Amino acid sequence: TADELVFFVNGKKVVEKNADPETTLLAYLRRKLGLRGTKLGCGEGGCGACTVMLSKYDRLQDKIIHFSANACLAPICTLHHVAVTTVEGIGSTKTRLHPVQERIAKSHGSQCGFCTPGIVMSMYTLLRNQPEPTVEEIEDAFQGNLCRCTGYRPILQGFRTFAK
Amino acid sequence: DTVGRPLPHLAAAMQASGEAVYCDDIPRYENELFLRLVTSTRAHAKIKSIDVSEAQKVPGFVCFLSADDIPGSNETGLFNDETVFAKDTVTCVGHIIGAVVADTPEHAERAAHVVKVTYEDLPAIITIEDAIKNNSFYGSELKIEKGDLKKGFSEADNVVSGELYIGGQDHFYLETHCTIAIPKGEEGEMELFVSTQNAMKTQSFVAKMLGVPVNRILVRVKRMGGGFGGKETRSTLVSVAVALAAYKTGHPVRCMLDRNEDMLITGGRHPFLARYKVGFMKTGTIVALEVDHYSNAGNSRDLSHSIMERALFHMDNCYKIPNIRGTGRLCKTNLSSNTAFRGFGGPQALFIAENWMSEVAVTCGLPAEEVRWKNMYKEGDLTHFNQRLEGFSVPRCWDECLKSSQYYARKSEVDKFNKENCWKKRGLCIIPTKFGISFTVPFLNQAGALIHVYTDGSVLVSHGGTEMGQGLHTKMVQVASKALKIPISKIYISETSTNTVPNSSPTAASVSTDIYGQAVYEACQTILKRLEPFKKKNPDGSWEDWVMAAYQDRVSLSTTGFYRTPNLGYSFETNSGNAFHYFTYGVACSEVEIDCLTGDHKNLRTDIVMDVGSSLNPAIDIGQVEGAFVQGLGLFTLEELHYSPEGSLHTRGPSTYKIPAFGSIPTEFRVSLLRDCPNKKAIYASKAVGEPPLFLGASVFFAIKDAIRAARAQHTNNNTKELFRLDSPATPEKIRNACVDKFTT
Amino acid sequence: PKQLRFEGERVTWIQASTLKELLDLKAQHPEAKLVVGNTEIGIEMKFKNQLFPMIICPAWIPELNAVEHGPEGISFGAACALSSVEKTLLEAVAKLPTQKTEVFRGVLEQLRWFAGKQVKSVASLGGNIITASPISDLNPVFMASGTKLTIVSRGTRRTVPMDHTFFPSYRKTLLGPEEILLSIEIPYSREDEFFSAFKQASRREDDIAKVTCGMRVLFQPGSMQVKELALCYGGMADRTISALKTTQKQLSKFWNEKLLQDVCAGLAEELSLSPDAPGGMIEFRRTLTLSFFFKFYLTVLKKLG
Ligand SMILES: Cc1cc2nc3c(=O)[nH]c(=O)nc-3n(C[C@H](O)[C@H](O)[C@H](O)COP(=O)(O)OP(=O)(O)OC[C@H]3O[C@@H](n4cnc5c(N)ncnc54)[C@H](O)[C@@H]3O)c2cc1C
Ligand SMILES: Nc1nc2c(c(=O)[nH]1)N[C@H]1C(S)=C(S)[C@@H](COP(=O)(O)O)O[C@H]1N2
Ligand SMILES: O=c1c(O)c(-c2ccc(O)c(O)c2)oc2cc(O)cc(O)c12
Ligand code: MOS
Ligand code: FES
Ligand code: FES
């Protein structure tokens, strides 16, 4: 009666045999897959704590496209044949940090740390599309990401390092 | 020795990789259930019936819980004036009536929505104005008075009088309230994982609720994704309900609030109303001041009394006022009980002070910097509460900020922009602050630590303070590393827990570094003294060899450390005794451009000079200054909570409540820490930094007022010495309407 | 690429692979909700406790994703993400004379501080349009510009410029039960045609009382004499409305201080708010309607200098 949902998370095949249409990707990542890096901060698309990168072959444009999305509003049933990247998909203190992770950490851009994965994924996405962005492109990537702790200055300053 | 070095936050790398564990990231037990609060939709009403029929049809529904389920006691809250679960009557929208427990959080959400309550509405009191009209107050009038008021006013060249309102603020910690409760099944024992700044009250309120000794309850706090005062007491609303569910079911139970529940239920900063009368000389010299403060406390006392006390202690800001009377009252209303929010009543009182100070300057037709400077305290001066200002560094901060911000040159250029532009105006203001350091309740100024050295020489530090992003654990590691004379890599802090350090004060009042720093230091000293003989026996040996020798000689490598802040004890009866240990000082200068036609504005530049003594960690301390400043900029310029007339909150998420974004911060944002200003009163000459910078946010508000003043001087009745009321927050609505023109008319 | 069916506790979701499936499904289930970005529906289900037991996701259908550059304008499939619309329009703006991109520029101004990248990469054009929030930032621009909507059901097809009649009442649009929105042609601007858009930058209520507008003026060839004038506002009623009465009066008047105060007089009466109007901020909102027009007035003169 019911079809299989197949997607990928951090390079790994996820085969959901009983997808519920109501299930969000945030719920799936956190509570089925056990990938708790992606956070719930509002559930209404306004804070970006739940930011992940989505990737797919665009039949029209021909290429693979990469973009950021709020996992709190993404129904898993929209993700058939899509590839999800989370904060744990890009680097780890157990293996090696991604440069985006190192620089936000070392630049004092993370205080309580709850917005950090979301902002990391916003910057990371930007770099997957534009490896040499401008300062303006950098500020722009974060219009969907809130931080209550840092006053934002350190985050931009650490990421400015990626421009020119 | 890293003390004074910009060591990054110890957890930042793991925070960036998503490896740092927050409460809801803890894995679930196989049998773990989920709780969701069932809450009042009425501001004031009798509960007639509760019908759970529909909830019971939801897949995975376990139970509904209410006041009848509680084994111990339904009375809770700091002053024992709250219910855990409301019984006959609700007293605010958001008031907790019960909880559903289900097998998934989605099922608990669904079941909670379908719980049907029947009410009979009773008449409600929502506004401060309503509360005053009904004499609906908690306790009696608070008052600080000094000098002769009916002498000062008799003598004053002029007076200014008026009324000012400042709206509240939601904490908007990125991680909302969260508790996991694990029932052990033996002797009422329960272990709780909680996003709270107050593991002591959590522990005590759970035990009281359950009817069980406090020694049965273990509360553990790894870290919070922000607290800001909001998890200092209101975290128990979730914790106690979760404990009850664990007790009833015998299963582990968790709850993390959705943002909308959190905004409605858990309280925010206190809104303040002030009526004031200031008397002054033609010179701008203040001769008398009378201020009556009113806070909107909501539907319980909570911390409201202490928040008003702090307001009263800061109604002077940095100004000497020979004759002064301040009063505070706490308005009892049908709103969620309001609570601690970074600043704890200080920013409200300081804002009231800068508001009339700004009106004094306009009335006398003098430059604002000149009137502020000429009224400033001097070294050795006493405050209105009769405490001496020792090491009063505002004059240095002021002078250095003026110089480095190029204030006088840019003030010229602001004036040129204003004469050359019709429908956009620039403003520029420079504001000081002082903020007193200590809990104003003397008994909270105590701190414990517990340190173990294991036989490999690694050190485990435990102290009563919690980490919420402010880098307290980092600072304690730098302290211990310096005190033990070993590198930071040998030392670890895992968590805060009631079984390692009991009876801890909430992590609050900006004093945590000072008091836990001292506790940690004393414990380290004890360790060094015990190790000293072994050092002498093996002088060219290593830390590890000394520890192992001490171990084998049966010398204990475990110790407590304790600090009690000396010489605190202010009396409202005698208007004497120190209320604070010392003060933290700062000055900010901010420039804005407003759009006269839309009420929008751009923050152009801000320069801050902050006295934090000799910083333990300049990077953390600057980070604290910038964070606090931006929270203050949000309080005064962006964030607005809005209620229906029936008292129900409209603004319940980031789409209707705007905290500062990446684009809200000043384009040029400079922060310097005052150099060569050691503080004899705290650990390693440092000073508390967490809360004192927030009010500097007001510099953006007074820059806005300055720009509105120019817009009015262009388009309305032209009196240079014309005053108008601008409440906080200065939103686009208020800014626009105040730019009276051919369109507003 | 084939049709997928997913079944949960309360909801059936069908991922439609072709236009025919979509139209067939929408005929069979007239009430079905079409989800693309889910940035509206996910909110209605979580926060308004709405239940929609039948969902059709058309995001895969090539026709709902097509970007087409024609003689009259640029046509976007209804499922095109707002970031795609933005990128296509930013590309057209950099390539075409300024006089052909006045509307594109307005759309781009509304898109600027409109959420963040995450929402804009998944929010559809058709989604913002059919949702029909009183405070939609795009509907007033589309209305003011007469952006053309291709609406399709099983068998039948039509193309209507968006006008005031398209939003009859609260959160309703003029599509029949079996119909879907297929594509949206955003027009190039004409010689002597100028366009602005503005929006309020706070807001405290869920989907009311945030002033947002599209403004369009078409002058007689080489004149300052009004031939067509359109002023559409969101945040002023239960729906996107046009100040028809006010603008009708300006037809064949000249663009002068007289035009200004008359429009500001017309706006004040036509769009007047009762003191009990949902969302409050009555004085502010009124003032913005005139202040926005005044900005448009001034910008139109500079664009004529
Ligand atoms: C945090 C955030 C910020 C936002 N800010 C703004 C803003 O500033 N200005 C603004 O205007 N909006 C704003 N929005 C709304 C956003 O623009 C809309 O939510 C989005 O365009 C809806 O598109 P969707 O694909 O996500 O719709 P969905 O949620 O998937 O569907 C929305 C509605 O459109 C219908 N629909 C979709 N496609 C068709 C079709 N082709 N034919 C017929 N009906 C169809 C659906 O049935 C449903 O009723 C914001 C939303 C979020 C979450
Ligand atoms: N990142 C961050 N900084 C913060 C807070 C927070 O929750 N997160 N709370 C503030 C408040 S309300 C206080 S009282 C102090 C408490 O910490 P301290 O005493 O260790 O400075 O930190 C402040 N700075
Ligand atoms: O955070 C604070 C707090 O909790 C309390 C308090 C008061 C009475 C109690 O019974 C209690 O448990 C706490 O006082 C304070 C006093 C301050 O000057 C500053 C603070 O930040 C607090
Ligand atoms: O004293 Mo901070 O928790 S308000
Ligand atoms: S949780 Fe806030 S945007 Fe997804
Ligand atoms: S570091 Fe705390 S919210 Fe960003």
CSV table of N, CA and C and ligand atoms in Angstrom, one decimal, chain A residues 104 108-117 119 146-152 155, chain B residues 15 22 172-175 224-226 228 468-469 659, ligand 6:
chain,number,residue,atom,x,y,z
A,104,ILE,N,34.9,29.6,13.9
A,104,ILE,CA,33.9,30.2,14.8
A,104,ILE,C,34.3,29.9,16.3
A,108,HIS,N,35.9,33.2,19.1
A,108,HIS,CA,35.0,33.5,20.2
A,108,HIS,C,33.6,33.8,19.7
A,109,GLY,N,33.2,33.1,18.7
A,109,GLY,CA,31.8,33.2,18.1
A,109,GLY,C,30.8,32.3,18.7
A,110,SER,N,31.2,31.6,19.8
A,110,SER,CA,30.3,30.6,20.4
A,110,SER,C,30.4,30.8,21.9
A,111,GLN,N,29.2,31.1,22.5
A,111,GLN,CA,29.2,31.3,24.0
A,111,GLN,C,28.4,30.1,24.5
A,112,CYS,N,27.1,30.2,24.7
A,112,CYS,CA,26.3,29.0,25.1
A,112,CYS,C,26.4,27.9,24.2
A,113,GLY,N,26.5,28.2,22.9
A,113,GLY,CA,26.8,27.2,21.8
A,113,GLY,C,25.5,26.6,21.1
A,114,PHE,N,24.3,27.1,21.5
A,114,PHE,CA,23.1,26.4,21.0
A,114,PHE,C,22.8,26.8,19.6
A,115,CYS,N,23.2,28.0,19.2
A,115,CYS,CA,23.0,28.5,17.8
A,115,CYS,C,24.2,28.1,16.9
A,116,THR,N,25.2,27.6,17.4
A,116,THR,CA,26.5,27.4,16.7
A,116,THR,C,26.3,26.4,15.5
A,117,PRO,N,25.7,25.2,15.8
A,117,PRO,CA,25.6,24.3,14.6
A,117,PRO,C,24.8,24.9,13.5
A,119,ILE,N,24.4,28.2,12.6
A,119,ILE,CA,25.3,29.2,12.0
A,119,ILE,C,26.4,28.5,11.1
A,146,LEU,N,19.6,33.3,14.6
A,146,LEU,CA,19.6,34.1,15.7
A,146,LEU,C,20.6,33.6,16.8
A,147,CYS,N,21.3,34.6,17.4
A,147,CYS,CA,22.2,34.3,18.6
A,147,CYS,C,21.8,35.3,19.7
A,148,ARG,N,21.6,34.8,20.9
A,148,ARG,CA,21.2,35.6,22.0
A,148,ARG,C,22.5,36.0,22.8
A,149,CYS,N,23.6,35.4,22.6
A,149,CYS,CA,24.7,35.5,23.5
A,149,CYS,C,25.8,36.4,23.1
A,150,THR,N,26.2,36.4,21.8
A,150,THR,CA,27.5,36.9,21.4
A,150,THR,C,27.4,38.4,20.9
A,151,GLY,N,26.3,38.9,20.6
A,151,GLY,CA,26.1,40.2,19.9
A,151,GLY,C,26.7,40.1,18.5
A,152,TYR,N,26.9,38.9,17.9
A,152,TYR,CA,27.2,38.7,16.5
A,152,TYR,C,28.6,39.1,15.9
A,155,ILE,N,31.3,36.5,15.4
A,155,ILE,CA,31.0,35.5,14.4
A,155,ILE,C,31.4,36.0,13.0
B,15,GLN,N,30.9,22.8,20.7
B,15,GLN,CA,29.7,23.5,20.4
B,15,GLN,C,29.5,23.7,18.9
B,22,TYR,N,23.3,19.2,25.4
B,22,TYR,CA,22.4,20.0,26.2
B,22,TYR,C,21.3,19.0,26.6
B,172,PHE,N,14.5,34.8,25.6
B,172,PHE,CA,14.8,34.2,24.4
B,172,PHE,C,16.2,33.5,24.4
B,173,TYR,N,16.5,32.8,25.5
B,173,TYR,CA,17.7,31.8,25.5
B,173,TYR,C,17.3,30.9,24.3
B,174,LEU,N,18.4,30.6,23.5
B,174,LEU,CA,18.1,29.7,22.3
B,174,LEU,C,17.6,28.3,22.7
B,175,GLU,N,18.1,27.8,23.8
B,175,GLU,CA,17.5,26.6,24.4
B,175,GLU,C,16.4,26.9,25.4
B,224,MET,N,23.5,25.1,30.0
B,224,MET,CA,22.3,25.6,29.4
B,224,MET,C,22.7,26.3,28.2
B,225,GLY,N,21.8,26.2,27.2
B,225,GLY,CA,21.8,27.1,26.0
B,225,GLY,C,21.2,28.5,26.3
B,226,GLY,N,21.8,29.2,27.3
B,226,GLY,CA,21.4,30.5,27.7
B,226,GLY,C,20.5,30.3,28.9
B,228,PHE,N,20.2,33.7,31.3
B,228,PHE,CA,19.9,35.2,31.4
B,228,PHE,C,19.0,35.6,32.5
B,468,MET,N,26.2,28.8,31.4
B,468,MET,CA,25.1,29.1,30.5
B,468,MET,C,25.6,29.8,29.2
B,469,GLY,N,26.9,29.7,28.9
B,469,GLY,CA,27.5,30.4,27.8
B,469,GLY,C,28.5,31.5,28.2
B,659,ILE,N,14.1,39.9,18.4
B,659,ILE,CA,15.4,40.1,19.1
B,659,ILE,C,16.4,40.5,18.0
D,6,FES,S1,26.1,31.3,21.5
D,6,FES,FE1,24.2,31.4,22.7
D,6,FES,S2,22.6,31.7,21.3
D,6,FES,FE2,24.4,31.9,20.1
